[PDB]
């Protein structure tokens, strides 16, 4: 009982660890990829219009 | 009581395992969809003005 | 007779043990899967509408 009643606190810390790690490894790369796509698309439009 | 503590532990584990990754995946999909939509709109505008000129 | 009249109490504890264990291993995973499906479906709708 003691083992499990402390593994619950282990998971209580794990939820916030997953919050931070998942944010870092998913949300920020998605934002960076969106910005990259935006800029490359803008460059492609700028090239195509004047060609 | 062993199983009750296990219930609490598995609730938190399921949260950390599937509940938050689902939200992160949703955010990733909507960000990438925004990027793709802007790219397609810009390409369509470029093609349209190409045709006009 | 004594053996069986105490195995009945063993099963009396077993019914609540099964209550708790079955709840933990079925009901909570079902709730988590429902939430996951809800969020993924919402993301798919959000992507499809704007595409």
UniProtKB/Swiss-Prot annotation, chains A, C:
Where in the cell is the protein located? Answer: Cell membrane; Endosome; Membrane, Caveola; Melanosome
The annotated subunit structure for this chain is: Heterooligomeric complex of flotillin-1 and flotillin-2 and caveolin-1 and caveolin-2. Interacts with ECPAS.
Similarity field: Belongs to the band 7/mec-2 family. Flotillin subfamily.
Task of the protein? May act as a scaffolding protein within caveolar membranes, functionally participating in formation of caveolae or caveolae-like vesicles.
Protein's recorded name? Flotillin-1
Protein species of origin:
Homo sapiens (Human)
The encoding gene is: FLOT1
Part of the whole protein covered? 258 to 308 of 427
UniProtKB/Swiss-Prot annotation, chain B:
Q: Where in the cell is it found?
A: Cell membrane; Membrane, Caveola; Endosome; Membrane
Q: How does it assemble?
A: Heterooligomeric complex of flotillin-1 and flotillin-2 and caveolin-1 and caveolin-2. Interacts with ECPAS.
Q: What family does the Swiss-Prot or TrEMBL record give for this protein?
A: Belongs to the band 7/mec-2 family. Flotillin subfamily.
Posttranslational mods: ZDHHC5-catalyzed palmitoylation may be required for the formation of higher-order complexes and for neurite outgrowth in cultured neural stem cells.
User: Intact protein stretch covered?
Assistant: 269 to 321 of 428
- Name used for this protein in its record: Flotillin-2
Chain's role: May act as a scaffolding protein within caveolar membranes, functionally participating in formation of caveolae or caveolae-like vesicles. May be involved in epidermal cell adhesion and epidermal structure and function.
User: In which tissues does this protein get expressed?
Assistant: In skin, expressed in epidermis and epidermal appendages but not in dermis. Expressed in all layers of the epidermis except the basal layer. In hair follicles, expressed in the suprabasal layer but not the basal layer. Also expressed in melanoma and carcinoma cell lines, fibroblasts and foreskin melanocytes.
């Amino acid at each position: 009982v003691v083992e499990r009643a402390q593994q619950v606190a282990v998971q209580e810390q794990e939820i916030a660890r997953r919050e931070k790690e998942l944010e870092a490894r998913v949300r920020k790369p998605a934002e960076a990829e969106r910005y990259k796509l935006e800029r490359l698309a803008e460059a492609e439009k700028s090239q195509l219009i004047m060609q | 009581a062993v199983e009750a503590q296990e219930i609490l532990r598995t609730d938190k584990e399921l949260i950390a395992t599937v509940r938050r990754p689902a939200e992160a995946e949703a955010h990733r999909i909507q960000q990438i969809a925004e990027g793709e939509k802007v790219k397609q709109v810009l390409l369509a505008q470029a093609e349209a003005e190409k045709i006009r000129k």
